Design a protein around this motif. Structure first.
Motif, PDB file in Angstrom:
ATOM      1  N   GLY A 223      36.779  52.198  72.042  1.00 34.49           N
ATOM      2  CA  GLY A 223      35.367  52.062  72.331  1.00 34.49           C
ATOM      3  C   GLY A 223      34.612  53.320  71.967  1.00 34.49           C
ATOM      4  O   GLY A 223      35.195  54.378  71.724  1.00 34.49           O
ATOM      5  N   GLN A 224      33.280  53.218  71.919  1.00 40.12           N
ATOM      6  CA  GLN A 224      32.627  54.445  71.474  1.00 40.12           C
ATOM      7  C   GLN A 224      32.476  55.449  72.616  1.00 40.12           C
ATOM      8  O   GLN A 224      32.095  56.598  72.374  1.00 40.12           O
TER       9      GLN A 224
ATOM     10  N   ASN B  60      28.496  44.929  69.019  1.00 35.82           N
ATOM     11  CA  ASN B  60      28.780  45.022  70.446  1.00 35.82           C
ATOM     12  C   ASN B  60      28.880  43.639  71.079  1.00 35.82           C
ATOM     13  O   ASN B  60      28.190  43.295  72.042  1.00 35.82           O
TER      14      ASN B  60
ATOM     15  N   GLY C  85      31.403  46.943  74.601  1.00 32.98           N
ATOM     16  CA  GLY C  85      31.833  45.781  73.853  1.00 32.98           C
ATOM     17  C   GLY C  85      32.987  46.006  72.908  1.00 32.98           C
ATOM     18  O   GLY C  85      33.899  45.173  72.872  1.00 32.98           O
ATOM     19  N   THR C  86      32.989  47.092  72.125  1.00 32.89           N
ATOM     20  CA  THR C  86      34.179  47.297  71.302  1.00 32.89           C
ATOM     21  C   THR C  86      35.368  47.693  72.167  1.00 32.89           C
ATOM     22  O   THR C  86      36.472  47.163  71.989  1.00 32.89           O
TER      23      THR C  86
ATOM     24  N   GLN D 279      34.019  59.053  72.867  1.00 26.56           N
ATOM     25  CA  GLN D 279      33.396  60.176  73.567  1.00 26.56           C
ATOM     26  C   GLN D 279      34.477  60.969  74.281  1.00 26.56           C
ATOM     27  O   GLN D 279      34.614  62.186  74.094  1.00 26.56           O
TER      28      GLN D 279
HETATM   29  N1  GTP Z   1      29.119  58.101  72.870  1.00 19.03           N
HETATM   30  C1  GTP Z   1      28.365  57.771  73.949  1.00 19.03           C
HETATM   31  N2  GTP Z   1      28.611  56.577  74.625  1.00 19.03           N
HETATM   32  C2  GTP Z   1      27.875  56.252  75.727  1.00 19.03           C
HETATM   33  C3  GTP Z   1      26.893  57.138  76.172  1.00 19.03           C
HETATM   34  N3  GTP Z   1      26.284  56.653  77.260  1.00 19.03           N
HETATM   35  C4  GTP Z   1      26.851  55.474  77.530  1.00 19.03           C
HETATM   36  N4  GTP Z   1      27.821  55.194  76.615  1.00 19.03           N
HETATM   37  C5  GTP Z   1      28.550  53.919  76.759  1.00 19.03           C
HETATM   38  O1  GTP Z   1      29.893  53.838  76.317  1.00 19.03           O
HETATM   39  C6  GTP Z   1      30.114  52.439  76.248  1.00 19.03           C
HETATM   40  C7  GTP Z   1      31.440  52.041  75.611  1.00 19.03           C
HETATM   41  O2  GTP Z   1      31.570  52.345  74.250  1.00 19.03           O
HETATM   42  P1  GTP Z   1      32.266  51.245  73.309  1.00 19.03           P
HETATM   43  O3  GTP Z   1      33.322  50.456  74.048  1.00 19.03           O
HETATM   44  O4  GTP Z   1      32.860  52.006  72.134  1.00 19.03           O
HETATM   45  O5  GTP Z   1      31.018  50.293  72.949  1.00 19.03           O
HETATM   46  P2  GTP Z   1      31.060  49.148  71.819  1.00 19.03           P
HETATM   47  O6  GTP Z   1      32.151  48.088  72.054  1.00 19.03           O
HETATM   48  O7  GTP Z   1      31.232  49.827  70.479  1.00 19.03           O
HETATM   49  O8  GTP Z   1      29.592  48.472  71.868  1.00 19.03           O
HETATM   50  P3  GTP Z   1      28.392  48.807  72.912  1.00 19.03           P
HETATM   51  O9  GTP Z   1      28.993  49.065  74.269  1.00 19.03           O
HETATM   52  O10 GTP Z   1      27.482  47.572  73.034  1.00 19.03           O
HETATM   53  O11 GTP Z   1      27.638  50.018  72.420  1.00 19.03           O
HETATM   54  C8  GTP Z   1      28.873  51.872  75.584  1.00 19.03           C
HETATM   55  O12 GTP Z   1      28.687  50.535  75.978  1.00 19.03           O
HETATM   56  C9  GTP Z   1      27.773  52.770  76.110  1.00 19.03           C
HETATM   57  O13 GTP Z   1      26.979  52.067  77.042  1.00 19.03           O
HETATM   58  C10 GTP Z   1      26.657  58.325  75.517  1.00 19.03           C
HETATM   59  O14 GTP Z   1      25.775  59.065  75.961  1.00 19.03           O
HETATM   60  N5  GTP Z   1      27.394  58.657  74.397  1.00 19.03           N
END
Ligand code: GTP
Ligand code: GTP
Ligand code: GTP
Lengths: 427, 150, 31, 438, 427
Positions: free
Chosen positions: A10-11, A99, A142-143, A15
């Protein structure tokens, strides 16, 4: 010997591993280049619980990174320690997730599970014997929810004998940013509760409150919050690495922690949170530690367990302490709130003492808790699920993927069962 | 390198050629700041900031994002010198997060920039690429001249 | 001249003088 | 070694050759005087020219070709040109009388007393050469003198020499444009005569060549110079293997052995993909993919044929320039995956690739682009039968009303030969669907 | 002394050899001019096995270069080491191939076989006692298969007591460039199965994949592609030239490899293949060598033996190893995939360890495989041969040369015989 392989997904998992890993490298004193700078023999005796060896004194991290959007990895790679990260470890995709959980669980996951499984089994064969694995991701991401649910489901059958440690951040209660996030979470937690053995719960307003409360610095970066929770993840793992008479194995912690299988969701607790003047206004003593340890304000997981009661609690103390102060502190707190515990089980404190302080501070600690304070969390999401499933908003996508409303029916039915499951045991 | 005069920050990219056997990622560095020395001991993040507020009266009620009572002394400022514009000259020693590097050429405006800055004018290119060796030549077998010489 | 009169943006729908007489080459050279 | 002899019949096929040695002298840097600068390439005549020119002890590059024409006007004019000192005077075989567009007059009335001399030319060129892989013939079907005169000489060089190759290059008759109504007459007379003797006859049509000019080259008023330049580039590309080398080197013998399926039909199609203007190349990029898409685009062939009305049999592409097999084999693999592309199931593989490292060069005073990656695309398909189908329904009409027969029967010919060609033609179509039918 | 004389055949072997001998030259340390620079005694000791000494410190390569086209031969003489090749050993013809199998087998060969036999027997008398010969060529090569089939037949009766090592490359399955190549291959293999004893099978497509996998440099040169394969047969020849506790003779090896006479088709296998940063990201250890050593992606010869099973396997190890790690690795792989080998023969592993590492790298190995994966290769050509024979396309040439369809009948019938025989032994 028993080691650990890490997964970042996930993003936010992207992080977290970045901050989580650099703290570790900074802890042991490895330069960003990779040439370890020998200063401590004790950090020179247990690097293989997490790191393998490369040539030229290089410690290769045993973590596998997966995502879809290259710019995330390019930022991750171009960071302070991307050079210590392997392009071998960089598995990714050619598509944008949108996502969407269904995409990441069925559509692009189908052709990416093969690569990661080969990568992890190659890394699994690289090492000898495992405690298990830990995964940094988000339940509302979501990812991360997409691959993680697939991966945790997969890693079960090949190795149903290890640690399925999970590290997911609970999304924002007041505003989920993503509107279909409640749909994403409900789907995942169905598989999560089935596949996991242990779960970490993290929320950012609690961190935001911590940022306001003790950090007192108005505007931090999200990485600063990432440092806070990486310190929590470090402390729970410092147990395994460091000497001193404390029982470190997660099984050792887990079996003391969970009386019934459905208990996987646990809450953290950390050690002195100190503001600008109070670094030199503080007499670091186990009492004032223990005072600050059991502060509802010092809490950072979801919301105050004041609403509920305490099932099981476990705290690990890091530094030059002794058996007696920790003992009397329980003897203090146990009488402080005897009724706030459950009459089912007395003597519910699980204590471990690490004699190896962190780099820069002497008397530290960490806390992991399992109290009756998760009900409102999935109760909160219950109204959200019922309301948007009341009129099936935003549903035409997942049907185009090939999903159906029936899956949602057993998903909520399971969660509602966990509601009674949690409610019945305590109430 | 790319130093920015608006934020006092630097950036590093790579010039890897074709068949280099290296990735396509360009920006080998962030666009942040370069500490004057090697890896700084992490200053327990949680106090790594600039300003100093003293007390919050906000949590009492909810009107704004709480009250910010500042200070007047600003203690706890830990010293982090950074690589600024001062140490810029052809030929130097720089540790880039652990990279003991050198300096040999400047682009176009630094010439004008440096004359204006203090007074400096002597700017000459310095070779950083490896020297090259020729392929010598060829000789020919000894001849007994059994027939025409050619 | 303005921008470019030596060559005027091939596909140049507006006309030019000298559309007759000396012809039998490409666009730019005749212009 | 590696050399051939080039032949040019009819004033139609002479200006088209003049450009090619103009062209061929450019990439070799041949000065119009006939010698190099003080740089040392002269000797026993063994260098890049040894396959093309004869720069003997005299030091003058002598092209290995014979121009044969029946009307002195043009051959005199080029004899007053710029490279006239290079050309051998009586290799420029001229004539004082024409063939009157008549196939037979050039084949019977005058060709007899002229062939003996050119036979003397070829043997005196045959003795000096060593490898003599074959011949290069520029001619035409609607030739006033190219048609009749080439027919007899090709017959004579076939009977004495039947062990080497004969490459036939001619402008195909325009399907809907006819500068002469007797053109179908002599044209089929050529075809039926050449079916059992010609080795490889490759064709082209000027209309589509002009269509290219104002499509992508953006020239609404080109000249022969450019059309001659284009075809001269085409033969330059196929002869680039002779001059230079590459990742793999191929020869015309491979071309013959690997293109023609069966006897009779030996008539593929040629195409050059990077036909673009200078400014178009200036602010754009060329790569194997788009040019592979370009060379297989139905509007880029110089023959008015739609491949979707036929089916593909052979494809020979000559990648000249800076290229790697990786994208090449990947791109053609995608071509194999294409569904609109219709090969016959008889050939699972039909791709003859030739790689040459040398980048194709521009010509001074030219209009081409600055090409790094180039290809001549040689293919043969079943969509060709419509051309002779057009010819016969054209021909069968005039034959029934036997127009212009008094002209040919007046000078000593008869009808049975004209009778032969039609079922010789009718044999050609029926074969085409029989091989077309899987 | 026991030596080998090479044969350079076909225009591919013209590139194969050109890279092959310079790989020999630089490993032993001779300059392009030919004046050896005395640096290693052992290579100075075991250079006679392939080279003869002339006047002035110059090792003459003992091979014969044969072609028809001067220019390709012109390119190699003008190559960096054309001076170390003999104008005496340059034999050729005055004719063009036409890429025709029959012309070089009956027409062009007839006046060239006489001279090449003279040169080799002159070279044969130049040396004392040969182990045998090795040949670089292609099965689908126009003149190489044309010349090879003739020469392999003739070398059979003159010396029926030596090693008829053959090295041929299989054309690309997706496209053969040459369309009569299936005729060319089928014609050759009919005599190849009769005369040869050892054959290496090579395909550029898998080799093209290798560039996409580990070379990771997008645009290679076929000479670099030769550089890949040139390492392969060099490794098996290092066993012969190098000392160390390992048996060198191919007869020591071939009898270990060939259970039944019809087994001549063998696949190469190479050891660590390294990418952009993995040189300094790899801890060179026998386990991590062994896993990569047994990788289907590391396979380069024809295709994945995942579809089939393993008859005989042999990996020769070059570097500073010991008998114990290779022993346990054999035990490890034995337990990993025990069912994937054939129950016909257990313990089907043959290993040799060369103590002399390559120049530049320390840990290395080479693998030769005789698995049940060649089936897909000659079924592919089976339908290819039939369909073009179903309507005898492109046949008028060979009838003109004097070839008849009856020749094709037994060539495929024997080919069909090999189909069942490889099938029957395994299935
Ligand atoms: N890198 C980064 N991620 C954040 C931050 N704040 C919240 N996130 C959360 O980290 C969550 C999980 O990341 P992923 O599982 O990689 O998300 P994804 O499946 O790529 O798709 P989305 O969650 O819809 O963005 C995201 O849903 C964001 O809501 C931030 O400040 N920086
Ligand atoms: N090959 C060639 N053909 C041309 C050229 N210009 C026009 N043509 C066409 O080619 C044909 C020339 O054929 P013929 O007129 O029979 O030439 P010929 O047999 O040598 O005898 P002539 O009638 O005297 O020219 C004409 O019908 C034109 O349509 C050119 O420069 N080269
Ligand atoms: N030298 C060389 N050969 C290649 C290359 N790529 C593919 N090949 C093939 O290797 C085969 C072997 O060459 P030869 O046996 O010498 O060929 P030949 O008998 O002279 O006749 P052809 O095969 O038609 O060229 C050729 O048929 C080519 O198809 C390459 O890059 N270099």
């Amino acid at each position: 010997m028993r080691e650990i392989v890490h997964l970042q997904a996930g993003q936010c998992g992207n992080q977290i591993g970045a901050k989580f890993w650099e703290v570790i490298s900074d802890e042991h004193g490895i330069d960003p280049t990779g040439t370890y700078h020998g200063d401590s023999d004790l950090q020179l005796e247990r690097i293989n619980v997490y790191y393998n060896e490369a040539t030229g004194g290089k410690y290769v991290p045993r973590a596998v990174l997966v995502d879809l959007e290259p710019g995330t990895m390019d930022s991750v790679r171009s960071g302070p320690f991307g050079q210590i990260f392997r392009p071998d470890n960089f598995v990714f995709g050619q598509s944008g997730a949108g996502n969407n959980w269904a995409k990441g669980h069925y559509t692009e996951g189908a052709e990416l599970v093969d690569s990661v499984l080969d990568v992890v089994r190659k890394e699994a064969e690289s090492c000898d014997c495992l405690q298990g694995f830990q995964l940094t991701h988000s339940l509302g991401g979501g990812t991360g929810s997409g691959m993680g649910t697939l991966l945790i489901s997969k890693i079960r059958e090949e190795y149903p004998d290890r640690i399925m440690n999970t590290f997911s951040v609970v999304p924002s209660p007041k505003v989920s940013d993503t509107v279909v996030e409640p749909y994403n979470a409900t789907l995942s937690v169905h598989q999560l509760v089935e596949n996991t053995d242990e779960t970490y719960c993290i929320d950012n307003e609690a961190l935001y409150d911590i940022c306001f409360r003790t950090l007192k610095l108005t505007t931090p970066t999200y990485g600063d919050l990432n440092h806070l929770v990486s310190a929590t993840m470090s402390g729970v793992t410092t147990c395994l690495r460091f000497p001193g008479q404390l029982n470190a194995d997660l099984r050792k912690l887990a079996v003391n922690m969970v009386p019934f299988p459905r208990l996987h969701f646990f809450m953290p607790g950390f050690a002195p949170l100190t503001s600008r003047g109070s670094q030199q206004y503080r007499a670091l003593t186990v009492p004032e530690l223990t005072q600050q340890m059991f502060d509802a304000k010092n809490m950072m997981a979801a919301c105050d367990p004041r609403h509920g009661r305490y099932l099981t609690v476990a705290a690990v103390f890091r530094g030059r302490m002794s058996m007696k102060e920790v003992d009397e502190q329980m003897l203090n707190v146990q009488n402080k709130n005897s009724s706030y515990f459950v009459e089912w089980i007395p003597n519910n404190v699980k204590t471990a003492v690490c004699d190896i302080p962190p780099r820069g501070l002497k008397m530290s600690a960490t806390f992991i808790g399992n109290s009756t304070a998760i009900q409102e969390l999935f109760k909160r999401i219950s109204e959200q699920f019922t309301a948007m499933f009341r009129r099936k908003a935003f549903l035409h996508w997942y049907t185009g993927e090939g999903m159906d409303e029936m899956e949602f029916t057993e998903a909520e039915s399971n969660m509602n069962d966990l509601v009674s499951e949690y409610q019945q045991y305590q109430d | 390198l790319h130093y920015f005069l608006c934020d006092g920050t630097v950036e590093i990219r790579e010039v890897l050629p074709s068949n280099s056997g290296r990735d396509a990622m360009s920006s080998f560095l962030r666009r942040g700041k370069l500490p004057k020395y090697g890896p700084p001991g992490i200053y327990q993040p949680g106090q790594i900031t600039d300003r100093a507020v003293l007390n919050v009266y906000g949590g009492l009620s909810e009107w704004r994002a709480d009250g910010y009572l500042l200070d007047k002394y600003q203690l706890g400022k830990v010293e982090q010198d950074f690589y600024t514009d001062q140490d810029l000259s052809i030929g130097a020693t720089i540790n880039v997060w652990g990279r003991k590097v050198l300096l040999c050429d400047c682009d176009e405006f630094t010439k004008t920039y440096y004359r204006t800055k203090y007074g400096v004018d002597n700017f000459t290119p310095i070779s950083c690429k490896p020297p090259h060796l020729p392929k010598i030549e060829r000789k020919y077998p000894p001849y007994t001249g059994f027939g025409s010489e050619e | 001249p303005n921008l470019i009169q030596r060559k005027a943006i091939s596909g140049y729908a507006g006309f030019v003088p000298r559309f007759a007489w000396v012809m039998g080459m490409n666009y730019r050279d005749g212009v | 070694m590696r050399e051939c002899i080039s032949i040019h019949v009819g004033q139609a096929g002479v200006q088209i050759g003049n450009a090619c040695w103009e062209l061929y002298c450019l990439e070799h840097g041949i000065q119009p005087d006939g010698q190099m600068p003080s740089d040392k390439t002269i000797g026993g005549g063994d260098d890049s020219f040894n396959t093309f020119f004869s720069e003997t002890g005299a030091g003058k590059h002598v092209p290995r070709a014979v121009f044969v024409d029946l009307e002195p006007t043009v051959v005199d004019e080029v004899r007053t040109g710029t490279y006239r000192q290079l050309f051998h005077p009586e290799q420029l075989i001229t004539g004082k009388e024409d063939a009157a567009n008549n196939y037979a007059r050039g084949h019977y009335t005058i060709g007899k007393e002229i062939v003996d001399l050119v036979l003397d030319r070829i043997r005196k060129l045959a003795d000096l050469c060593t490898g003599l892989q074959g011949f290069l013939i520029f001619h035409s079907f609607g030739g006033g003198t190219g048609s009749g005169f080439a027919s007899l000489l090709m017959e004579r060089l076939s009977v004495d020499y039947g062990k080497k190759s004969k490459l036939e290059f001619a402008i195909y008759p325009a399907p809907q444009v006819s500068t002469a109504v007797v053109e179908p007459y002599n044209s089929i007379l050529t075809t039926h005569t050449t079916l059992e003797h010609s080795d490889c006859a490759f064709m082209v049509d000027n209309e589509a060549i002009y269509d290219i000019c104002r499509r992508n080259l953006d020239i609404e008023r080109p000249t022969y110079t450019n059309l001659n330049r284009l075809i001269g580039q085409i033969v330059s590309s196929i002869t680039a293997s002779l001059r230079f080398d590459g990742a793999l080197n191929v020869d015309l013998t491979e071309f013959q052995t690997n293109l023609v399926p069966y006897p009779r039909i030996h008539f593929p199609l040629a195409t050059y993909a990077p036909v673009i203007s200078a400014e178009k190349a200036y602010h754009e990029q060329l790569s194997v993919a788009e040019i592979t898409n370009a060379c297989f685009e139905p509007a880029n062939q110089m023959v008015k044929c739609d491949p979707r009305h036929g089916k593909y049999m052979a494809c020979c592409m000559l990648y000249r320039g800076d290229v790697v097999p990786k994208d090449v084999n990947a791109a053609i693999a995608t071509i194999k995956t294409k569904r609109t592309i219709q090969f016959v199931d008889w050939c699972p593989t039909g791709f003859k690739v030739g790689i040459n490292y040398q980048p194709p060069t521009v010509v001074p005073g030219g209009d081409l682009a600055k090409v790094q990656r180039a290809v001549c695309m040689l293919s043969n398909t079943t969509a060709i039968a419509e051309a002779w189908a057009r010819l016969d329904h054209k021909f069968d009409l005039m034959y029934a009303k036997r127009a212009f027969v008094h002209w040919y029967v007046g000078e000593g010919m008869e009808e049975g030969e004209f009778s032969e060609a039609r079922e010789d033609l009718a044999a050609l179509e029926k074969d085409y669907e029989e091989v077309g039918v899987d």
